[PDB]
Backbone:
């Protein structure tokens, strides 16, 4: 095909010689072991091998042979309930052939070749088709797992095997075109499979963290970003989505995140129930995990595969939630190549490509009608990590002003003890107006007004905060200390959930909505308390405050009536005193 | 076997010799002198026509007329054997004590290969270690890679030693004997002081814990470069003691700040890029492999818990060493000058100690059911606490209300009674007792973070 | 004011000094690229 | 320089505050410093359509002069790309405007030329036929983000805080498309609206502008948090 | 080359009260004036030439946000000498240069003005140079030093900015011509950050 | 020997060609009037020289010769009192032959060669020794000075001169190997000197000056810094540290401190009286002063002499105080050497191998049991200046 040998091997990169006719970015095998390569530069006939795994133990003058396909995960039915290396290798089988070591020199298959499956067809043979037109529905768990024409294929059918178990590899469709569709179909990664067309979004991506659903929120096509220094909950706020999002598929993938946080979701996740079936929640799950410890270059691979997976599922028709855990390391990874190939860099040494390969990523999708005429959403909420705390640093900032919905996760907040506390005096979402329809109808018809008044206090409260630190809470009188305290409670109780309290760690709108109406009331009547002639001073020390306190803890079932009880308790417990 | 000559350039700890063409990137080769002394060095950049050797020692007097380089192993591997258990070894290790050479029962690659994450097993076990802070708030667990962020004048080493001395599982909140866990230690040094040596050694001799334990050494006055081999070495003696022979082993890698220092040197003396603060940017990876081996394997037995102690300069927390450690290990606990002036020993603060693996193995027949809510309350109070330490010192000498008075009153308290402690060890239970005693002082109806039953249960 | 002022400057000069070295270091890289490829002219 | 004729004319916007207190005069550049998340865009596209110069109040025949809004954003999301086109088509005014809008993802190179396009196209309006143009470029943060990459590869050493040395110049020339020129009656308005990252007035990208563009009209959180729209402060701001 | 610098000791009129009585500059003096704009600073510059005490006016700054640079151009012909009733532009010489203008143009800009001033000076008159946008002056300098790879230093303006900046001022005072007469070269330093 | 000549000259750097098998790090006389350098880089056949003198005026073509021996100090008796400076030349004799300036490149002996001495051999022929033994005492001031056998030398004894008047040159002890075990010996600065064991500290080292001592003492061996801005104590607290004591000898090596800044050191000193045995204080000092304007690089050498003098002395039982003040200087040294040798710095220009050598300089001090089984401890008290 095209073959040469090692000329210069030193570091994760190598330079082979005796090569020509290569193409940019192409998988290869290097060393006697065979390891998985990439073409990333040419210079006459010598080529920079980028070598996906480790190295060590190599000699100069060993195989170097390309096949000339440029990366791609082979996508088809049966992928859930697994874990996948950076080139989608199922570690199960690996573990079964090794022991307890990720060892080089490994080759297996992406989708297992044994299991056969219950087929069903749609179209009759002797029919016409065009790109991405649905064909067969193999069932798969609580899902219905369709199969499409691989994009950019068109023609006319000629046979169709009827129902029964059938292999993954099998050609179960023949064409009058001499072509063959088999169950899966391989698709690159650098490209970006089209869809029928692009369209606006308006459906909220529910999430159940009050803080991500009453204040800042996200569109369905949403793109956002979450940052915060080390020890800030960065991971855990993606944990919750992975077990309380509201869609078909969580596709949690993290690159450069430790084992411990991964494996845990593989021993807890079996025993839980989804809000959309009742089954083991692990059905809507991917995990393409590729922890820090592993190779260098894999950290680059990793993401773009799970972007693609994000398309692949959307494609069938569902509602992708992809979230990359800790994309920033990716930058570091990219830049480690750089160093060795000698590319002068831009600030903070990142090679100038920060935008180049960022900006393509995040733009990707949301509510986009498919070739199949389904409603496709790509939901990404990117995690990032700065390396300082200085948000001024480039790789961070470049995220803003490429995507909307910015949440910032304050650092000094969290040292105390809340979670997943954010600064809402940093943060800002954009998506928040085009959510109004759905909210009105679905939730309550007066909700957005009732929320803006909450921000009315909340963002105004700093107005006083500063003056507190300029002359104490002393000599701030009473419409003064009203607010301070109201709001004090507003974050003490409306902004801090957990991810470990047994219940109360997920909410419906309508519940949350409830909590939120109370407080307004309490503000209102208090406003009329002091104006009438009494004082907050004791009002704080009313028993009824603490009822508003503990409040969040009761569950839904009780919730209506809980809430109704305070609805009595208010009007009496003001007028009396 | 064989033998090269063809040097061209020597300067710094980087060596150069040509026409070699059959080594491998990562190979212990030798540096036979033209006088009689051998040294060892690494093949870290091998080209078609020259290559890098990486001298593992100081260089002195070497020529451009003789000298021999010599392939010792293709890929670095060292032996291991449960034989050793009371030895010393230097940098690469060539046993130092005047006792016999080793016997290996395996050879093992020094790099190791990182753990398949499926192969990880869920950590869980809780241990008793004594020194409240940890044992209440953050709590060490068998397998948490924890590092104790230290300054300098703060006593880094001392505090470590207690842990070496009181770590012990509960056998009663679990169903096993105590003749199921004693312990084991594997210490390592990477360039320390001599005075730090002896202090160390005697506390192994006085517990008589010195045996059943290997401690590698490297003082800070030996060769510079061998700073980058040694850590891993010991850790690789760790997999061996851990996995096939079953043990629980607390490993102390005290001081890591000399690590990156030496690391830096090779870095830039070659040409790789900087990447914040002039530490070579690929740091992240090299500092993955050291801490990341550890944990608890599946359906297995054994344990590797690492506590290494950083010594970042000043009381900064953005000097990039402790930086990246932060992601890397899970959580940390900090010593701070902040306390130290007051004389409270052994200082710790809660305020920036996280400890990730904690919501596992706690309370559920693993500690008293009060724990979950204890910590966050007691925690948050103190947070709340020192806060008014400031507002007070600005407005007046006080002007606080009689609600808020109670807060400040507990400030001095918390630090002083509870976080101070003698050598006098504590137990999980006696600790807790105290714990409630500092929650006692605030009046009820101020503790929202605890729930109504638990609060009254032991008020 | 005149103190916390006095801190701020201190940030400035050090934040700045950071990058002098940045460039100077970076400069040298160029030197290499050109010197190096001046003998990938060969002959 | 001689050719240019001193401004003296007026332009309404259709927004209030930015006409009453601090008034966009005609043949004038001026920019709206936004914050990170305050909503620039909307306050853009209003002032897109709305404006119409009333010559009326000064005295002369109405349709002696018509109005052209020339618009160019960049680094727009599939999302943003749609908020324009919806508003634009709504009551329509596409039929009196030109589009140019270089998608976010789109190659970084063309980005660089992109504005220069809609600038030069603007010339052909007023100088060869007389017209009254309003050019509104957007997000020049992007303009430099994108810029840097080019220079970083094509070689140079970046000067102060990045932002390649020859910025001053390069940025200058994307603003000399303005003013009236004696005899000739039509002219260009610039309003380029951009966002800072450091939320300052000290980071160079905006600061720089503030030496060659002539004023400043900020948007604060304050207004916006309390929920107003379009939040343009008073006092920070002045032409 | 000139033949004897001579000590300052010569008044300089400007007529402005506040100018001379309190803060004279002396002829051959050398001053500088900052002044945020949007605050009437050009006023002075106008009046400056208007009375003067010299008789040759050279005003030349270089680069200044478009429109204001055009203001100079327009108001200049309107003002008239109040010493002969002759149109003011008659005894004048302006060099302009607007932001956008080519880089190494701008760098030379001052120097231009400086030379030309010397010429006229040499003829025995008393002269009056003005220049503004010295603060911007350095700009070009940065730029040139961008495109030449010489490290910066200090804040960001290369080092020479304690010299070329210097020389711009030295050349002035009370020169005595080779023609044996006396010729005024005061420069008053606008700057503006 | 080996010959060669020049390739470029740069500041105080020099390169040379024509070498082959030049050893790494040595005494390298180059320059017609000699210069005595140190070999850092060895490239090719082209030896990078270092030179500790103002290189003003060299041509291209001079000899390059080596001795195949690192830079090293003669150690023995005849130490205490006198100046020796960084490159170990005792200024005394220089002062004396050459007027009032340093005329670079003058070669001289170090430790004298003409003063006579009474010797008592303390061991008889054919008997055993380990290296580091004492062979004989000699009258050195109020001191039981000993003549220590060099380590890594051992052998039986063929003869041993009896008592009498001698100079040190003379072999006093011929080893039974036909090895003229001379009085004093050469032990290169780099490296340290082995010892039987380091023994914990516990004994105070006072200094007497109150505050400094009573509250924040130091232990007998140990180490501590003095950072501090300019314009506070540094230059003269050490001086008072020296003039009072709590140990024997004082080997003091300043570096690049002004003419007056150690003038005064010298001249006042002969007048004070030891509070340990009485007597004039020169009797326990070592001067390694160093003019500020001295050859830039020669500070790096200078500190290292100091410390190695201290060990030697330590092995003779005593307690040695060495407080080379000002490590910032040392810094500067390397700070320049890098720049020449063209290496990408790290943080603020210092080469990264700073704590490379730094570490060791602090290490060697301590308290020990030597080969002679003698107590002794070198104390170091560092001063730094950012
Ligand atoms: N929702 C929560 N409830 C309780 N504790 C939390 C919550 N979120 C975070 N924390 C605590 O704070 C820690 C911060 O999360 P962490 O895993 O360190 O995130 P990262 O390191 O990715 O920023 C958690 O490990 C947990 O102990
Ligand atoms: N703290 C002190 N109080 C009074 N005078 C002092 C004090 N310390 C030193 N001096 C004087 O200040 C002079 C300056 O020298 P010194 O403080 O030793 O070091 P340097 O000026 O090099 O920092 C001393 O020579 C001494 O005369």
Residues:
């Amino acid at each position: 095909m095209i073959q040469g040998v090692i000329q210069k091997i030193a570091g994760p990169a190598v330079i082979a010689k005796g090569m020509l006719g290569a193409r940019m970015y192409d998988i290869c095998k290097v060393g006697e072991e065979g390891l998985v390569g990439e073409i990333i530069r040419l210079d006459g006939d010598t080529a920079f091998v980028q070598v996906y795994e480790d190295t060590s133990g190599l000699k100069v003058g060993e195989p170097v042979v390309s096949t000339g396909l440029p990366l791609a995960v082979e996508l088809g039915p049966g992928m859930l309930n697994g874990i996948y290396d950076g080139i989608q290798r199922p570690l199960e089988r690996i573990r079964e052939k090794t022991g307890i070591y990720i060892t080089r020199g490994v080759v297996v298959h992406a989708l297992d070749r044994e299991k056969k499956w219950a087929w069903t067809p749609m179209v009759k043979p002797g029919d016409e088709v065009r790109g991405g037109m649905v064909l067969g529905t193999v069932p798969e768990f609580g899902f219905t797992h369709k199969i499409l024409v691989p994009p950019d294929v068109r023609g006319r059918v000629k046979e169709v095997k009827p129902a029964g178990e059938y292999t993954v590899e099998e050609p179960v469709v023949v064409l009058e075109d001499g072509t063959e569709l088999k169950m899966y179909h391989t698709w690159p990664v650098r490209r970006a499979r089209p869809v029928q067309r692009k369209l606006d979004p308006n459906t909220p991506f529910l999430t159940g963290m009050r803080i991500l659903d009453v204040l800042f929120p996200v569109a369905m096509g949403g793109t956002a970003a979450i940052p915060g220094p080390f020890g800030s909950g960065k991971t855990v706020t993606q944990q919750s989505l992975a077990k309380w999002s509201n869609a078909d598929v969580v596709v949690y993938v993290g690159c450069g995140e430790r084992g411990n946080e991964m494996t845990d979701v593989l021993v807890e996740f079996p025993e839980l129930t989804d809000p959309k079936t009742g089954g083991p929640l692990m059905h809507r799950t991917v995990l393409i995990a590729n922890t820090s410890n592993m190779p260098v270059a894999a950290r680059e691979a990793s993401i773009y595969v799970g972007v693609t997976i994000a398309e692949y599922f959307r494609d069938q028709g569902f509602s992708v939630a992809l979230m990359a855990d800790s994309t920033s390391r990716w930058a570091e990874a990219l830049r480690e190549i750089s160093s060795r190939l000698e590319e002068m860099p831009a600030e903070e040494g990142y090679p100038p490509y920060l935008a180049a390969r960022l900006a393509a990523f995040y733009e990707r999708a949301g509510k986009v009608i498919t070739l199949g005429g389904e409603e496709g959403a790509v939901t990404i909420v990117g995690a990032v990590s700065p390396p300082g705390g200085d948000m001024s640093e480039p790789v961070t900032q470049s995220t803003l002003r490429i995507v909307g919905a910015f949440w910032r996760l304050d650092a000094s907040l969290a040292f105390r003890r809340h979670f997943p506390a954010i600064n809402w005096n940093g943060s800002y979402s954009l998506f928040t107006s085009a959510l109004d329809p759905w909210y009105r109808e679905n939730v309550a018809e007066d909700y957005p007004e009732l929320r803006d008044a909450i921000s009315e206090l909340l963002q105004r409260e700093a107005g006083l905060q500063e003056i507190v630190q300029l002359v104490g809470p002393d000599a701030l009188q009473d419409a003064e200390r009203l607010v301070i305290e109201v709001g004090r409670i507003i974050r003490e109780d409306f902004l801090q959930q957990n991810a470990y309290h047994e219940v109360d760690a997920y909410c419906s709108m309508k519940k949350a909505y409830g909590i939120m109406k109370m407080i307004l009331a309490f503000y209102k009547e208090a406003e009329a308390a002091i104006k009438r002639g009494v004082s907050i001073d004791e009002i704080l020390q009313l028993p009824v405050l603490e009822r508003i306190g503990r409040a969040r803890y009761v569950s839904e079932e009780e919730f209506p009536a809980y809430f109704e009880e305070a609805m009595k308790e208010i009007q009496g417990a003001f007028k009396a005193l | 076997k064989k033998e090269y000559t063809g040097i061209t350039y020597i300067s710094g700890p980087l060596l150069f010799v040509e026409n070699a063409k059959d080594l491998a990137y990562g190979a212990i080769v030798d540096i036979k002198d033209g006088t009689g002394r051998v040294r060892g060095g690494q093949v870290i950049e091998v080209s078609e026509e020259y290559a890098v050797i990486q001298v593992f020692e100081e260089t002195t007097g070497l020529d451009l007329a003789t000298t021999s380089v010599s392939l010792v192993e293709d890929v670095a591997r060292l032996g291991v054997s449960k034989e050793m258990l009371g030895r010393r070894f230097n940098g690469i290790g060539k046993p130092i004590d005047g006792l016999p050479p080793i016997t290996p029962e395996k050879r093992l690659p020094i790099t190791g290969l990182p753990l398949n994450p499926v192969a990880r097993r869920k950590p869980e076990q809780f241990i008793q270690t004594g020194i409240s802070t940890i044992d209440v708030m953050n709590t060490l667990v068998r397998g948490q890679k924890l590092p104790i962020f230290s300054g300098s004048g703060l006593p880094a080493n001392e505090i470590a030693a207690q842990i070496a001395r009181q770590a012990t599982v509960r056998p009663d909140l679990s169903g096993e004997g105590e003749k199921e866990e004693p312990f084991a230690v594997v210490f390592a040094a990477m360039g320390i002081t001599q005075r730090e040596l002896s202090y160390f050694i005697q506390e192994f001799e006085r517990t008589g814990a010195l045996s059943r334990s290997v401690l590698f050494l490297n003082k800070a006055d030996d060769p510079t470069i061998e700073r980058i081999l040694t850590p891993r070495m010991a850790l690789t003696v760790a997999e061996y003691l851990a996995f096939e022979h079953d043990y629980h082993v607390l490993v102390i890698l005290t001081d890591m700040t000399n690590y990156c220092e030496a690391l830096r040197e090779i870095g830039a003396a070659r040409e790789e890029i900087p990447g914040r603060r002039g530490y070579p940017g690929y740091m992240y990876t090299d500092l993955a492999t050291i801490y990341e081996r550890a944990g608890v394997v599946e359906g297995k037995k054994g344990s590797v818990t690492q506590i290494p102690i950083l010594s970042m300069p000043d009381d900064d927390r953005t000097h990039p060493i402790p930086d990246l450690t932060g992601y890397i290990t899970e959580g940390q606990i900090q010593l701070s000058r902040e306390l130290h002036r007051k004389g409270i020993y052994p200082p710790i603060d809660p305020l920036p100690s996280l400890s990730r693996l904690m919501n596992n193995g706690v309370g559920k027949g693993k500690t008293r059911e009060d724990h979950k809510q204890v910590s966050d309350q007691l925690y948050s109070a103190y947070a709340n606490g020192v806060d008014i330490r400031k507002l007070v010192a600005i407005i007046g000498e006080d002007a606080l209300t009689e609600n808020d008075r109670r807060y400040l009153q507990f400030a001095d308290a918390f630090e002083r009674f509870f976080i101070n402690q003698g050598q006098q060890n504590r137990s999980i239970e006696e600790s807790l007792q105290i714990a409630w005693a500092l929650l006692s002082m605030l009046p009820q109806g101020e503790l929202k973070r605890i729930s109504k039953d638990h609060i009254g249960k032991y008020y | 004011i005149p103190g916390i002022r006095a801190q701020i400057r201190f940030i400035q000069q050090v934040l700045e000094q950071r990058e002098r070295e940045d460039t100077f270091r970076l400069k040298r890289i160029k030197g290499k690229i050109e010197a190096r490829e001046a003998e990938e002219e060969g002959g």
Q: What stands out?
A: Chain E is about 35% helix and 15% strand. The two ends of chain E are 34 Å apart (CA to CA).
